[PDB]
Amino acid sequence: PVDFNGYWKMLSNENFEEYLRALDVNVALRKIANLLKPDKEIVQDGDHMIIRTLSTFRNYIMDFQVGKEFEEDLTGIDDRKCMTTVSWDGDKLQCVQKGEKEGRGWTQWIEGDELHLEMRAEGVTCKQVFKKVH
Numbered sequence: 001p002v003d004f005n006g007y008w009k010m011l012s013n014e015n016f017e018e019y020l021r022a023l024d025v026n027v028a029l030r031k032i033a034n035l036l037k038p039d040k041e042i043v044q045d046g047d048h049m050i051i052r053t054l055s056t057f058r059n060y061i062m063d064f065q066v067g068k069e070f071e072e073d074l075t076g077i078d079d080r081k082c083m084t085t086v087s088w089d090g091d092k093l094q095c096v097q098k099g100e101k102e103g104r105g106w107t108q109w110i111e112g113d114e115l116h117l118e119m120r121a122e123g124v125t126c127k128q129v130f131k132k133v134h
């Protein structure tokens, strides 16, 4: 019961500000990012899955190779570089980053027509709820 191939827009954020603080994002970026709420458009195609991000500010596409490893340069976010992998624990999805800090390792869980998840970073939890647009 997982089908990413669709359209998902962000509704709100309860810790997008606090999460920006973990990576020590500028005061300007935090300001701009507040009004911003990128819309993700996933395109599943086998073992290759691309997660779009179109905020009309700066395009940051990634190539999530399910089960396989790939680097991930976070330059544009908070200027970072690491190695990320993704697994399928079960009904949920779980991505682990072999970087620094203590938290960097995403987790997900879909619950219908709203792509919910639990972002983690440096011990901080960021709940960002995305809704299907269909």
Ligand SMILES: CC1=C(/C=C/C(C)=C/C=C/C(C)=C/CO)C(C)(C)CCC1
Binding pocket: 029, 033, 036, 038, 051, 053, 055, 057, 058, 060, 076, 077, 106
């Ligand atoms: C702060 C900030 C941004 C947030 C970027 C992030 C954090 C994207 C998330 C990537 C992940 C974690 C993907 C795993 O599926 C963007 C550039 C987009 C817009 C303005 C500045």
